[PDB]
Protein backbone atom coordinates (compact mmCIF):
# COMPACT_ATOMS: atom_id res chain seq x y z
CA UNK A 575 0.00 0.00 0.00
CA UNK A 576 1.23 3.49 -1.02
CA UNK A 577 2.41 5.97 1.60
CA UNK A 578 -0.24 8.57 2.45
CA UNK A 579 0.50 12.31 2.51
CA UNK A 580 -2.36 13.68 4.63
CA UNK A 581 -2.02 11.55 7.75
CA UNK A 582 -3.58 13.99 10.20
CA UNK A 583 -6.00 16.74 9.16
CA UNK A 584 -4.41 19.29 11.53
CA UNK A 585 -0.86 18.84 10.23
CA UNK A 586 0.41 21.20 7.53
CA UNK A 587 2.24 19.66 4.55
CA UNK A 588 4.14 22.03 2.26
CA UNK A 589 3.87 20.86 -1.36
CA UNK A 590 5.81 22.18 -4.33
CA UNK A 591 4.08 23.54 -7.44
CA UNK A 592 5.34 21.55 -10.43
CA UNK A 593 2.98 22.45 -13.29
CA UNK A 594 0.26 24.91 -14.21
CA UNK A 595 -2.09 24.59 -17.16
CA UNK A 596 -4.55 27.14 -18.47
CA UNK A 597 -8.13 25.87 -18.27
CA UNK A 598 -9.54 29.13 -19.65
CA UNK A 599 -9.20 32.92 -19.41
CA UNK A 600 -9.45 32.99 -15.59
CA UNK A 601 -9.05 29.35 -14.48
CA UNK A 602 -6.03 27.03 -14.21
CA UNK A 603 -5.07 23.54 -13.20
CA UNK A 604 -2.35 23.65 -10.53
CA UNK A 605 -0.35 20.44 -10.09
CA UNK A 606 1.66 19.97 -6.92
CA UNK A 607 4.15 17.22 -6.14
CA UNK A 608 3.46 14.89 -3.24
CA UNK A 609 6.43 14.14 -0.93
CA UNK A 610 7.60 11.34 -3.25
CA UNK A 611 6.52 9.97 -6.64
CA UNK A 612 5.18 6.91 -4.79
CA UNK A 613 2.96 8.83 -2.34
CA UNK A 614 -0.79 9.27 -2.68
CA UNK A 615 -2.67 12.22 -1.24
CA UNK A 616 -5.00 10.31 1.07
CA UNK A 617 -8.30 11.64 -0.19
CA UNK A 618 -11.64 9.90 0.19
CA UNK A 619 -13.66 10.68 -2.95
CA UNK A 620 -15.70 13.83 -2.52
CA UNK A 621 -13.53 15.48 0.13
CA UNK A 622 -11.46 18.67 -0.14
CA UNK A 623 -8.22 20.13 1.24
CA UNK A 624 -7.27 23.57 2.65
CA UNK A 625 -4.40 25.78 1.50
CA UNK A 626 -3.02 28.39 3.85
CA UNK A 627 -0.54 31.25 3.70
CA UNK A 628 0.24 34.65 5.13
CA UNK A 629 -0.82 37.06 2.39
CA UNK A 630 -0.17 40.79 2.80
CA UNK A 631 0.14 40.40 6.56
CA UNK A 632 -3.02 38.34 7.17
CA UNK A 633 -3.66 34.61 7.61
CA UNK A 634 -5.57 33.32 4.60
CA UNK A 635 -7.01 29.79 4.60
CA UNK A 636 -9.15 28.52 1.70
CA UNK A 637 -10.56 25.13 0.69
CA UNK A 638 -9.94 23.65 -2.77
CA UNK A 639 -11.26 20.36 -4.09
CA UNK A 640 -8.73 18.13 -5.83
CA UNK A 641 -9.82 16.75 -9.19
CA UNK A 642 -7.21 13.98 -8.89
CA UNK A 643 -7.51 10.81 -6.78
CA UNK A 644 -5.55 8.28 -4.75
CA UNK A 645 -4.93 6.39 -7.99
CA UNK A 646 -2.66 9.29 -8.99
CA UNK A 647 0.79 8.62 -7.55
CA UNK A 648 3.10 11.53 -6.77
CA UNK A 649 0.86 14.52 -7.45
CA UNK A 650 -2.34 16.39 -6.69
CA UNK A 651 -4.30 18.51 -9.19
CA UNK A 652 -6.41 21.52 -8.15
CA UNK A 653 -8.60 23.50 -10.53
CA UNK A 654 -8.80 27.08 -9.35
CA UNK A 655 -10.43 30.23 -10.68
CA UNK A 656 -8.33 33.37 -10.30
CA UNK A 657 -10.26 36.45 -9.20
CA UNK A 658 -8.24 39.29 -10.70
CA UNK A 659 -8.03 42.78 -9.20
CA UNK A 660 -9.14 45.86 -11.18
CA UNK A 661 -11.66 43.79 -13.13
CA UNK A 662 -14.97 43.56 -11.31
CA UNK A 663 -16.38 46.91 -10.12
CA UNK A 664 -17.79 45.33 -6.95
CA UNK A 665 -14.47 43.65 -6.06
CA UNK A 666 -11.58 45.87 -7.20
CA UNK A 667 -9.04 44.12 -4.94
CA UNK A 668 -9.77 40.73 -6.51
CA UNK A 669 -9.31 37.54 -4.50
CA UNK A 670 -6.55 37.02 -1.95
CA UNK A 671 -5.62 33.34 -2.20
CA UNK A 672 -6.44 32.86 -5.88
CA UNK A 673 -4.18 35.73 -6.95
CA UNK A 674 -1.45 34.52 -4.60
CA UNK A 675 -1.62 31.12 -6.28
CA UNK A 676 -1.57 32.72 -9.75
CA UNK A 677 1.64 34.52 -8.76
CA UNK A 678 3.43 31.35 -7.59
CA UNK A 679 6.41 30.17 -9.60
CA UNK A 680 7.20 26.56 -10.39
CA UNK A 681 9.14 25.31 -7.38
CA UNK A 682 7.33 27.49 -4.84
CA UNK A 683 5.53 25.75 -2.00
CA UNK A 684 2.29 26.19 -0.10
CA UNK A 685 0.88 24.33 2.91
CA UNK A 686 -1.89 21.74 2.43
CA UNK A 687 -4.08 20.22 5.14
CA UNK A 688 -7.05 17.83 5.07
CA UNK A 689 -9.00 15.93 3.93
CA UNK A 690 -12.39 17.30 4.96
CA UNK A 691 -16.03 17.27 3.98
CA UNK A 692 -19.29 15.62 4.94
CA UNK A 693 -19.61 13.39 1.85
CA UNK A 694 -17.53 10.36 0.88
CA UNK A 695 -18.24 8.31 -2.24
CA UNK A 696 -17.49 4.69 -1.42
CA UNK A 697 -18.05 3.25 -4.90
CA UNK A 698 -20.81 1.29 -6.62
CA UNK A 699 -23.46 3.89 -5.87
CA UNK A 700 -22.67 4.04 -2.17
CA UNK A 701 -22.36 7.47 -0.49
CA UNK A 702 -21.46 8.08 3.14
CA UNK A 703 -22.99 11.42 4.09
CA UNK A 704 -22.83 12.97 7.57
CA UNK A 705 -25.74 15.25 8.53
CA UNK A 706 -23.13 17.56 10.07
CA UNK A 707 -19.57 17.54 11.44
CA UNK A 708 -20.58 15.92 14.75
CA UNK A 709 -22.71 13.07 13.47
CA UNK A 710 -22.24 9.59 12.04
CA UNK A 711 -22.39 9.10 8.26
CA UNK A 712 -25.64 7.81 6.81
CA UNK A 713 -24.87 5.35 4.05
CA UNK A 714 -27.06 5.97 1.00
CA UNK A 715 -26.82 3.76 -2.08
CA UNK A 716 -28.47 4.91 -5.29
CA UNK A 717 -28.71 3.88 -8.95
CA UNK A 718 -28.39 7.45 -10.23
CA UNK A 719 -27.08 10.82 -9.09
CA UNK A 720 -28.09 14.28 -10.24
CA UNK A 721 -25.32 16.86 -10.15
CA UNK A 722 -25.84 20.61 -10.43
CA UNK A 723 -22.59 22.58 -10.68
CA UNK A 724 -21.89 26.25 -11.17
CA UNK A 725 -18.44 27.48 -12.17
CA UNK A 726 -15.67 25.96 -10.07
CA UNK A 727 -18.42 23.97 -8.30
CA UNK A 728 -17.60 21.42 -10.99
CA UNK A 729 -14.60 20.22 -8.96
CA UNK A 730 -16.27 17.86 -6.43
CA UNK A 731 -18.56 16.62 -9.19
CA UNK A 732 -15.60 15.70 -11.39
CA UNK A 733 -14.03 13.78 -8.49
CA UNK A 734 -17.16 11.67 -8.19
CA UNK A 735 -17.71 11.30 -11.94
CA UNK A 736 -14.14 10.11 -12.51
CA UNK A 737 -14.30 7.66 -9.62
CA UNK A 738 -17.46 6.11 -11.06
CA UNK A 739 -16.32 5.84 -14.67
CA UNK A 740 -13.05 4.13 -13.69
CA UNK A 741 -14.89 1.13 -12.28
CA UNK A 742 -16.62 -0.85 -15.04
CA UNK A 743 -18.69 -2.60 -12.34
CA UNK A 744 -19.97 0.71 -10.99
CA UNK A 745 -23.31 1.13 -12.77
CA UNK A 746 -24.24 4.47 -11.21
CA UNK A 747 -25.62 6.91 -13.78
CA UNK A 748 -24.53 10.55 -13.33
CA UNK A 749 -26.65 13.37 -14.74
CA UNK A 750 -24.67 16.63 -14.75
CA UNK A 751 -26.22 20.07 -15.27
CA UNK A 752 -23.31 22.53 -15.46
CA UNK A 753 -23.93 26.30 -15.35
CA UNK A 754 -21.45 29.04 -16.29
CA UNK A 755 -21.62 32.70 -17.30
CA UNK A 756 -20.75 32.23 -20.98
CA UNK A 757 -19.59 29.51 -23.35
CA UNK A 758 -15.94 30.49 -22.82
CA UNK A 759 -16.48 30.10 -19.07
CA UNK A 760 -17.33 26.39 -19.37
CA UNK A 761 -14.55 24.74 -17.39
CA UNK A 762 -12.93 21.46 -18.47
CA UNK A 763 -15.26 21.12 -21.45
CA UNK A 764 -12.91 18.79 -23.36
CA UNK A 765 -12.55 16.55 -20.29
CA UNK A 766 -16.32 16.49 -19.76
CA UNK A 767 -17.09 15.79 -23.41
CA UNK A 768 -14.50 12.99 -23.50
CA UNK A 769 -16.27 11.43 -20.51
CA UNK A 770 -19.57 11.73 -22.39
CA UNK A 771 -18.07 10.20 -25.52
CA UNK A 772 -16.61 7.25 -23.61
CA UNK A 773 -19.35 6.63 -21.02
CA UNK A 774 -22.66 7.92 -22.39
CA UNK A 775 -24.63 5.11 -20.70
CA UNK A 776 -23.45 6.33 -17.29
CA UNK A 777 -22.90 10.02 -17.93
CA UNK A 778 -25.52 12.51 -19.11
CA UNK A 779 -24.26 16.02 -19.80
CA UNK A 780 -26.08 19.34 -20.10
CA UNK A 781 -24.96 22.98 -19.99
CA UNK A 782 -26.61 26.25 -19.23
CA UNK A 783 -24.96 29.64 -19.73
CA UNK A 784 -26.05 33.07 -18.47
CA UNK A 785 -25.42 34.47 -21.95
CA UNK A 786 -25.65 32.16 -24.94
CA UNK A 787 -23.69 32.29 -28.22
CA UNK A 788 -25.47 32.46 -31.59
CA UNK A 789 -25.46 28.78 -32.36
CA UNK A 790 -26.28 27.13 -29.05
CA UNK A 791 -27.79 23.68 -28.56
CA UNK A 792 -28.05 23.72 -24.78
CA UNK A 793 -29.80 25.86 -22.18
CA UNK A 794 -29.57 29.55 -21.35
CA UNK A 795 -30.07 31.39 -18.05
CA UNK A 796 -29.78 30.55 -14.36
CA UNK A 797 -30.75 26.99 -13.39
CA UNK A 798 -34.54 26.74 -13.62
CA UNK A 799 -37.33 24.22 -13.10
CA UNK A 800 -37.34 23.01 -16.72
CA UNK A 801 -33.61 22.21 -16.67
CA UNK A 802 -33.97 20.22 -13.45
CA UNK A 803 -36.96 18.35 -14.83
CA UNK A 804 -35.27 17.57 -18.15
CA UNK A 805 -31.65 16.98 -17.14
CA UNK A 806 -31.61 15.24 -13.77
CA UNK A 807 -33.22 11.86 -13.01
CA UNK A 808 -36.89 12.01 -12.01
CA UNK A 809 -37.79 11.97 -8.29
CA UNK A 810 -39.51 8.57 -8.73
CA UNK A 811 -36.08 7.02 -9.28
CA UNK A 812 -35.04 8.39 -5.86
CA UNK A 813 -31.67 9.69 -7.04
CA UNK A 814 -29.33 11.65 -4.80
CA UNK A 815 -29.05 15.24 -6.00
CA UNK A 816 -25.66 16.85 -5.37
CA UNK A 817 -25.20 20.61 -5.73
CA UNK A 818 -22.12 22.84 -5.76
CA UNK A 819 -21.75 26.46 -6.84
CA UNK A 820 -22.25 30.06 -5.74
CA UNK A 821 -24.46 30.23 -2.61
CA UNK A 822 -27.23 32.14 -4.43
CA UNK A 823 -27.27 29.47 -7.15
CA UNK A 824 -27.98 26.90 -4.48
CA UNK A 825 -30.42 29.05 -2.49
CA UNK A 826 -32.45 30.62 -5.28
CA UNK A 827 -31.97 28.52 -8.41
CA UNK A 828 -31.53 24.98 -7.08
CA UNK A 829 -33.51 24.48 -3.86
CA UNK A 830 -36.84 26.08 -4.90
CA UNK A 831 -36.81 24.28 -8.25
CA UNK A 832 -35.89 20.90 -6.76
CA UNK A 833 -38.89 21.38 -4.51
CA UNK A 834 -41.12 22.24 -7.49
CA UNK A 835 -39.98 19.13 -9.37
CA UNK A 836 -40.45 16.93 -6.31
CA UNK A 837 -36.97 16.02 -5.08
CA UNK A 838 -37.23 15.77 -1.29
CA UNK A 839 -34.72 17.58 0.88
CA UNK A 840 -33.49 14.22 2.26
CA UNK A 841 -32.21 13.27 -1.21
CA UNK A 842 -30.28 16.52 -1.65
CA UNK A 843 -26.77 17.48 -0.59
CA UNK A 844 -24.83 20.71 -1.08
CA UNK A 845 -21.03 20.57 -0.97
Ligand SMILES: Cc1cc2nc3c(=O)[nH]c(=O)nc-3n(C[C@H](O)[C@H](O)[C@H](O)COP(=O)(O)OP(=O)(O)OC[C@H]3O[C@@H](n4cnc5c(N)ncnc54)[C@H](O)[C@@H]3O)c2cc1C
Nearest residue numbers: 637638639654655657658662665668669670671672726729
Ligand atom coordinates in the same frame (compact mmCIF):
# COMPACT_ATOMS: atom_id res chain seq x y z
C1 LIG B 1 -15.60 23.39 0.49
C2 LIG B 1 -15.12 24.35 -0.61
C3 LIG B 1 -14.32 23.90 -1.66
C4 LIG B 1 -13.89 24.83 -2.67
N1 LIG B 1 -13.13 24.30 -3.72
C5 LIG B 1 -12.77 25.20 -4.72
C6 LIG B 1 -12.06 24.74 -5.90
O1 LIG B 1 -11.78 23.41 -6.09
N2 LIG B 1 -11.68 25.59 -6.87
C7 LIG B 1 -11.95 26.92 -6.69
O2 LIG B 1 -11.56 27.79 -7.63
N3 LIG B 1 -12.61 27.40 -5.62
C8 LIG B 1 -13.02 26.56 -4.61
N4 LIG B 1 -13.73 27.09 -3.58
C9 LIG B 1 -13.59 28.53 -3.31
C10 LIG B 1 -12.29 28.92 -2.61
O3 LIG B 1 -12.21 28.37 -1.34
C11 LIG B 1 -12.15 30.43 -2.46
O4 LIG B 1 -13.31 30.92 -1.89
C12 LIG B 1 -11.85 31.13 -3.80
O5 LIG B 1 -10.69 30.62 -4.36
C13 LIG B 1 -11.67 32.62 -3.59
O6 LIG B 1 -10.75 32.88 -2.58
P1 LIG B 1 -9.89 34.18 -2.66
O7 LIG B 1 -8.99 34.19 -1.46
O8 LIG B 1 -9.06 34.23 -3.91
O9 LIG B 1 -10.92 35.35 -2.70
P2 LIG B 1 -11.41 36.25 -1.50
O10 LIG B 1 -10.42 37.36 -1.20
O11 LIG B 1 -11.68 35.52 -0.24
O12 LIG B 1 -12.82 36.83 -1.88
C14 LIG B 1 -13.07 37.46 -3.07
C15 LIG B 1 -14.47 37.22 -3.51
O13 LIG B 1 -14.94 38.36 -4.13
C16 LIG B 1 -15.33 38.01 -5.42
N5 LIG B 1 -14.38 38.52 -6.40
C17 LIG B 1 -13.18 39.10 -6.17
N6 LIG B 1 -12.64 39.43 -7.35
C18 LIG B 1 -13.53 39.03 -8.37
C19 LIG B 1 -13.51 39.09 -9.81
N7 LIG B 1 -12.43 39.63 -10.49
N8 LIG B 1 -14.57 38.59 -10.52
C20 LIG B 1 -15.63 38.06 -9.88
N9 LIG B 1 -15.69 37.97 -8.53
C21 LIG B 1 -14.63 38.47 -7.76
C22 LIG B 1 -15.41 36.51 -5.42
O14 LIG B 1 -16.68 36.12 -4.97
C23 LIG B 1 -14.46 36.13 -4.49
O15 LIG B 1 -14.79 34.90 -3.81
C24 LIG B 1 -14.22 26.16 -2.61
C25 LIG B 1 -15.04 26.61 -1.52
C26 LIG B 1 -15.47 25.71 -0.56
C27 LIG B 1 -16.34 26.25 0.59
Ligand SMILES: NC(=O)c1ccc[n+]([C@@H]2O[C@H](COP(=O)([O-])OP(=O)(O)OC[C@H]3O[C@@H](n4cnc5c(N)ncnc54)[C@H](O)[C@@H]3O)[C@@H](O)[C@H]2O)c1
Nearest residue numbers: 724725726727753754755796797819820821822823827845
Ligand atom coordinates in the same frame (compact mmCIF):
# COMPACT_ATOMS: atom_id res chain seq x y z
N1 LIG C 1 -18.58 24.04 -1.17
C1 LIG C 1 -17.72 23.43 -2.14
O1 LIG C 1 -17.32 22.28 -1.99
C2 LIG C 1 -17.29 24.20 -3.35
C3 LIG C 1 -16.38 23.67 -4.28
C4 LIG C 1 -16.02 24.44 -5.42
C5 LIG C 1 -16.63 25.71 -5.58
N2 LIG C 1 -17.52 26.16 -4.67
C6 LIG C 1 -18.15 27.57 -4.89
O2 LIG C 1 -18.71 27.68 -6.18
C7 LIG C 1 -18.64 29.08 -6.54
C8 LIG C 1 -18.01 29.20 -7.84
O3 LIG C 1 -17.92 30.53 -8.24
P1 LIG C 1 -17.68 30.98 -9.72
O4 LIG C 1 -16.91 32.30 -9.62
O5 LIG C 1 -16.87 29.98 -10.49
O6 LIG C 1 -19.17 31.17 -10.27
P2 LIG C 1 -19.72 32.20 -11.30
O7 LIG C 1 -19.80 33.55 -10.69
O8 LIG C 1 -18.88 32.25 -12.56
O9 LIG C 1 -21.20 31.69 -11.53
C9 LIG C 1 -21.41 30.44 -12.10
C10 LIG C 1 -22.84 30.09 -12.24
O10 LIG C 1 -23.43 30.18 -10.99
C11 LIG C 1 -24.74 30.63 -11.14
N3 LIG C 1 -24.95 31.84 -10.37
C12 LIG C 1 -24.07 32.81 -10.06
N4 LIG C 1 -24.70 33.78 -9.35
C13 LIG C 1 -26.02 33.41 -9.22
C14 LIG C 1 -27.16 33.99 -8.62
N5 LIG C 1 -27.04 35.27 -7.94
N6 LIG C 1 -28.38 33.34 -8.68
C15 LIG C 1 -28.48 32.15 -9.32
N7 LIG C 1 -27.43 31.57 -9.90
C16 LIG C 1 -26.18 32.19 -9.87
C17 LIG C 1 -24.90 30.93 -12.57
O11 LIG C 1 -25.54 29.83 -13.22
C18 LIG C 1 -23.58 31.10 -13.03
O12 LIG C 1 -23.44 30.91 -14.41
C19 LIG C 1 -17.97 29.80 -5.42
O13 LIG C 1 -18.90 30.38 -4.61
C20 LIG C 1 -17.24 28.74 -4.71
O14 LIG C 1 -17.04 28.98 -3.35
C21 LIG C 1 -17.87 25.47 -3.58
